[PDB]
Amino acid sequence: MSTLYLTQPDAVLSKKHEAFHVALKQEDGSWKKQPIPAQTLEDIVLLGYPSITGEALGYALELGLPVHYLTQFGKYVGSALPSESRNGQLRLAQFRAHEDPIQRLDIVKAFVKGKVHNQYNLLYRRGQVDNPLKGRGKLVMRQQTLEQVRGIEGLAAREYFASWQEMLGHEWTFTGRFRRPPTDPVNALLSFGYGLLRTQVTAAVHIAGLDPYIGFLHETTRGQPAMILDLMEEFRALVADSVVLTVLKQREIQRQDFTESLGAFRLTDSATKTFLGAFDRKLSSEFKHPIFNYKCTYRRAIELQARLLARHLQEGVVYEPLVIR
């Protein structure tokens, strides 16, 4: 519902008694101060590290407004969140279960079952014969440890990425994905989407009162949150990963990237602004919720799965993750 994005690193936000004013021009005039409302907004994303009035920030969090920070490239760096939730009993079970792996396992098998399926049922959307994966999908259930599994997701991912070039075409090149800087341009686009995806996820956890730093897959021993990535995993393949293939069949085929000083295939400005149009377009989707006839949007499904997850923990409900064929 009406999100805000920022690209320009010369834009300042101030408050005028109930609302925001952006100042762009940068001394070719009077900065072109453009007014903006907040009382309609539910999320913000900042990329070029723009300047903001501190007196204004405290007004967004009197409204329930998360603030997200990114880079020109799209990698996630951090976020500033409003007043939190006060359910410790939740966060205790979130932990009381974290050290009993028997519970941790019966859960992760669901995240991945709902994730790898999300891929095979995706590749059938794109038209791929076999990419043998349901076996791999339902393989997990015959496992009983974690280390057995983390190698598997990396395998299905490797099996998921080798079927990639043939699905794109000849204009681009993709063999695999690098945790590196994006030695490949597209992987930079993923670090962009996969980087900005935490934004809507990093908030849903704050709604359920969950601790992002306690997860079930990513052991919180590298200082990385895990309820996010454990949750973010289910969505990397179908929303940010389906989105890219939705724009590279019509748009930004080439000419809109830039390489400099590292190869470091960065994006061009004014192409970024088209990228997000599909992202909020994607988040303005319905898909009818193929469990019930809910007809919730993607944007909400995250808030839902998170709130749903607490109930798995306090009320003992099942967590059937999202799968779409």
Binding site: H17, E18, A19, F20, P35, P37, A38
Partner: peptide, 12 residues
């Protein structure tokens, strides 16, 4: 003028 400062905050 204060009300204009408001509605730009709630609408267009």
């Amino acid at each position: 003028t204060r009300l204009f400062d408001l509605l730009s905050g709630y609408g267009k």
